[PDB]
Amino acid sequence: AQELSQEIKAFLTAREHARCGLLLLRSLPPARAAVLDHLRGVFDESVRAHLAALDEPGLEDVVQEVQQVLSEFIRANPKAWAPVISAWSIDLMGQLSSTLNELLQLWMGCRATRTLMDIYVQCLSALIGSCPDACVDALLDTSVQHSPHFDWVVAHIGSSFPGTIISRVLSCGLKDFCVHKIASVVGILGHLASRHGDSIRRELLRMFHDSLPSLQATVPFLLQLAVMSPALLGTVSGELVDCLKPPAVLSQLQQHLQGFPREELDNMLNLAVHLVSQASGAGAYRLLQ
Amino acid sequence: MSDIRHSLLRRDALSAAKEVLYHLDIYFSSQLQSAPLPIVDKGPVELLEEFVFQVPKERSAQPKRLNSLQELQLLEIMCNYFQEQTKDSVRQIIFSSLFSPQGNKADDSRMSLLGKLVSMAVAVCRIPVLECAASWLQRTPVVYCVRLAKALVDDYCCLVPGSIQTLKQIFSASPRFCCQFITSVTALYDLSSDDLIPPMDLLEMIVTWIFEDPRLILITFLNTPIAANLPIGFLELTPLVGLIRWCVKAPLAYKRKGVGMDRDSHLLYSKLHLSVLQVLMTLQLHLTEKNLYGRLGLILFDHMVPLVEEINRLADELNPLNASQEIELSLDRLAQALQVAMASGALLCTRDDLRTLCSRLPHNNLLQLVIS
Numbered sequence A: 001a002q003e004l005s006q007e008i009k010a011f012l013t014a015r016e017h018a019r020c021g022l023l024l025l026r027s028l029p030p031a032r033a034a035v036l037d038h039l040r041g042v043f044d045e046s047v048r049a050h051l052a053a054l055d056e057p058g059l060e061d062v063v064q065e066v067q068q069v070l071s072e073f074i075r076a077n078p079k080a081w082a083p084v085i086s087a088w089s090i091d092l093m094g095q096l097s098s099t100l101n102e103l104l105q106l107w108m109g110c111r112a113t114r115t116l117m118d119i120y121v122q123c124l125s126a127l128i129g130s131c132p133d134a135c136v137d138a139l140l141d142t143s144v145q146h147s148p149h150f151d152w153v154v155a156h157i158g159s160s161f162p163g164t165i166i167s168r169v170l171s172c173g174l175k176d177f178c179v180h181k182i183a184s185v186v187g188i189l190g191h192l193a194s195r196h197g198d199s200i201r202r203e204l205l206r207m208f209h210d211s212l213p214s215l216q217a218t219v220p221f222l223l224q225l226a227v228m229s230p231a232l233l234g235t236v237s238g239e240l241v242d243c244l245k246p247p248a249v250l251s252q253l254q255q256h257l258q259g260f261p262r263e264e265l266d267n268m269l270n271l272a273v274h275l276v277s278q279a280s281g282a283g284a285y286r287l288l289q
Numbered sequence B: 001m002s003d004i005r006h007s008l009l010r011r012d013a014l015s016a017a018k019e020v021l022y023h024l025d026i027y028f029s030s031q032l033q034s035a036p037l038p039i040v041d042k043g044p045v046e047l048l049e050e051f052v053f054q055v056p057k058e059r060s061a062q063p064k065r066l067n068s069l070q071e072l073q074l075l076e077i078m079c080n081y082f083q084e085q086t087k088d089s090v091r092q093i094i095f096s097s098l099f100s101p102q103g104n105k106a107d108d109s110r111m112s113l114l115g116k117l118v119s120m121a122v123a124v125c126r127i128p129v130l131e132c133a134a135s136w137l138q139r140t141p142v143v144y145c146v147r148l149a150k151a152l153v154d155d156y157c158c159l160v161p162g163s164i165q166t167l168k169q170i171f172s173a174s175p176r177f178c179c180q181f182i183t184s185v186t187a188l189y190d191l192s193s194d195d196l197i198p199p200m201d202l203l204e205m206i207v208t209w210i211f212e213d214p215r216l217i218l219i220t221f222l223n224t225p226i227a228a229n230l231p232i233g234f235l236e237l238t239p240l241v242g243l244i245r246w247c248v249k250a251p252l253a254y255k256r257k258g259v260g261m262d263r264d265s266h267l268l269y270s271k272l273h274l275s276v277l278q279v280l281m282t283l284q285l286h287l288t289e290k291n292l293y294g295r296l297g298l299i300l301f302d303h304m305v306p307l308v309e310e311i312n313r314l315a316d317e318l319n320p321l322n323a324s325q326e327i328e329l330s331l332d333r334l335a336q337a338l339q340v341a342m343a344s345g346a347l348l349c350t351r352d353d354l355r356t357l358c359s360r361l362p363h364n365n366l367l368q369l370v371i372s
Helices: A002-012 A015-027 A029-055 A060-076 A078-098 A101-108 A111-127 A133-146 A151-160 A162-179 A182-211 A218-228 A230-244 A247-257 A262-278 A284-288 B002-009 B013-034 B042-051 B068-084 B088-099 B106-124 B127-138 B142-159 B164-169 B175-188 B200-212 B214-223 B240-256 B259-289 B301-321 B324-344 B351-360 B365-371
Strands: none
Touching: A002 A015, A002 A029, A002 B068, A002 B106, A015 A029, A015 A060, A029 A060, A029 A078, A029 A111, A029 B068, A029 B106, A029 B142, A060 A078, A060 A111, A078 A111, A078 A133, A078 A151, A101 A111, A101 A151, A111 A133, A111 A151, A133 A151, A133 A162, A151 A162, A151 A182, A162 A182, A162 A218, A182 A218, A182 A230, A218 A230, A218 A247, A218 A262, A230 A247, A230 A262, A230 A284, B002 B013, B002 B042, B013 B042, B013 B068, B013 B088, B042 B088, B068 B106, B068 B127, B088 B106, B088 B127, B106 B127, B106 B142, B106 B164, B127 B142, B127 B175, B142 B164, B142 B175, B142 B200, B164 B200, B175 B200, B175 B214, B175 B240, B200 B214, B200 B259, B214 B259, B240 B259, B240 B301, B240 B324, B259 B324, B301 B324, B301 B351, B324 B365, B351 B365
């Protein structure tokens, strides 16, 4: 009891202070957040200690030790540790980003940022099998306030895990489109296009079919996405003709379009004109036929 | 009271809370020196809400919020004050004024603070804080006692692996707090759902606590003047009902829900049932010594009716799943508990009452023998 009290007092009143915080994390539950908050001060300085080093050293061991402690804590009980640590880490990445390939290379160059993405990766990989939403939401939610300085974590995660990140990104983009960030969505989708065009095309096609206030705006949202990002319309024009080919699909498209006023139908027509004008890579002859 | 609020509005949140605690100390000491029964005025409650729990009284005023670090400073200062407070009456009254429910939006925050403070009391072994928490649990409605028990179980059973040992070391420090914590835990984990099975480490530590000193559960009953009418909506005087519910509903709940861990749970529940039966037999002497034999029943029939209904519902649900052995074990445990309680006078009821109550239960030889 007395030693724990002395540890608490010494912690509350950098390497030694952080080790005191880690011991309290391992021993005294109620102080966790405070230690976590202190750990935030450990990380931010490091990034500065990195950034100034780019402009022109004993805390990297602290970051490594915190990483081992967090990894052990997740491996002991992922269901109880992964959400909290993931949310705290995502808040960390958001704040140090506020305070795509070039930015990715710049930020994975820092040891602290790499460790942050690593603990997020292990937390989600622990929570993919049961319930990754608490992680993904913690990502997606944070992505609201830190765009466009945030996007590259989302890009890295989608590169590592496309099947859920792509769908969630499309859903949140559609939500924003209905409400009103869409530029950030375009940027990340273009970034992951070069390696996951198949999955992006598949998800876009499934959303398009499922649509056939959120469900009415899917087609205009898709057209706006294609007009913003050449990569996606290049990825999808390979099977756009096969997608519009069946008569039932075209009839459903007409029926859905009948619900908008003529000003909106004119805009929908004009969007297709820009796509078929500045989009086709190889299916232009088949499309025009 | 208006002058102090203006001065505290100019200070930082931690210093404001510390000055609030110091002024409460002075005010309650003066009131107890002047009167034997102090009256908790609205002033201290509003002051605690505004400056300790940080509930803004003015809509347009930005609330100064303690960070987790400053809140840990507050917890440390609060624990130090409780340890340094010599007079027990002032300590208990200030604990009540700090943590008595008020029915407002602040209570939740208060709960969190209490749900943390008691946790800190477990870590550094502050006996006065544990005694005050036990008294609060005794004098608080069950809805907040369950919340505090859930918070403590989360900190010491599900979050840190191996920290439960510390809570176990509480047994030799504050037995009253241990009994109240067991009562609140039994009120919390009723085994009605798969998420309400008590934690395995918590179950083991409870079983060890009861087996080491069976009288622990009766400590409150042995140290409280028993009124003619127990208040409705509060924790029971003795958690014997919770232990009966646990022991009888464990087989059905586990069947509804790892083979070795299930065997360990079965052995632990059998040990707990034996300990509870022994407590029931020993209860007769304590009841006779207090001139309460045949007059006060620590186990209520109105509390056994929902238990029997739940047993019948669980048996009906689990019958297609070939759960005959679990149903038989549950019925045997219930019959043993009923027989021992009736023999020791813990349950005040007639045999016709048991005939009416257990008529809907599946046939059991031991249950029929007890009934007849």
